[PDB]
A paper describes a structure:
At the cell division site, [name] protofilaments form a highly dynamic, membrane-bound structure, the Z-ring, which serves as a scaffold for the recruitment of the extra-cytoplasmic cell wall biosynthetic machinery. Here we investigate the physiological function of [name] [name], the only cell division-associated protein from Actinobacteria known to interact with the conserved C-terminal tail of [name]. Our structural data revealed the [name]-binding pocket, defining the [name] homodimer as the functional unit, and suggesting a reversible β-sheet-mediated oligomerization interface possibly regulated via an alpha helical switch. We found that [name] filaments and lipid membranes have opposing effects on [name] polymerization, pointing to a complex dynamic role of the protein at the division site, involving [name] bundling, Z-ring tethering and membrane reshaping activities that are needed for proper Z-ring assembly and function.
Residue numbers in the entry:
A (entry chain B): 65 to 151
B (entry chain A): 65 to 149
C (entry chain Q): 434 to 441
D (entry chain P): 434 to 442
Amino acid sequence: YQSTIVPVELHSFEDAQVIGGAFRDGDAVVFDMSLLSREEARRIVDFAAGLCFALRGKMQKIDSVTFAVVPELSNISTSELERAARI
Amino acid sequence: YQSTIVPVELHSFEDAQVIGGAFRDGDAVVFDMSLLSREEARRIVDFAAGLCFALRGKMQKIDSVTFAVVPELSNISTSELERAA
Amino acid sequence: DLDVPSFL
Amino acid sequence: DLDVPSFLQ
């Protein structure tokens, strides 16, 4: 299936809702954690792991501050996620 | 009557797979975090919050070391979870 | 303190 | 270190 790639800049910790809403809608999400504390970034990765497990998605680390969640039926490449994140 | 409440004893973050599998199957899960550090317990609660968001479930704190994830339309009450725990 | 997050 | 958990790798 073909999915949209939603880039998310986490400006505050309450932005896990944005990752959740887009991924639950069947979109791939590439999220940047460079504006968060070390502790907040750990919380986001754990929450995204939960979303991913529940909907049988795929999770990947792009770099030290960038991760992505991809729906089960989507074939989205690492390069496509990097381009969407402007990496 | 005889609704499925899955008990889980956590030893590390990897045991989150057991909570996820049961909850994704539409079962309520009651998990104990007494063997974990406060940092590890925080990680488990965040993972379970991700599960809840994805499947529109309910999360509740039973005590300082016991939490539960309940499917959206579960016919189980807080008192039933407390009795099971 | 260990709690259920605000949005839940 | 921040990584994807074992069960998703």
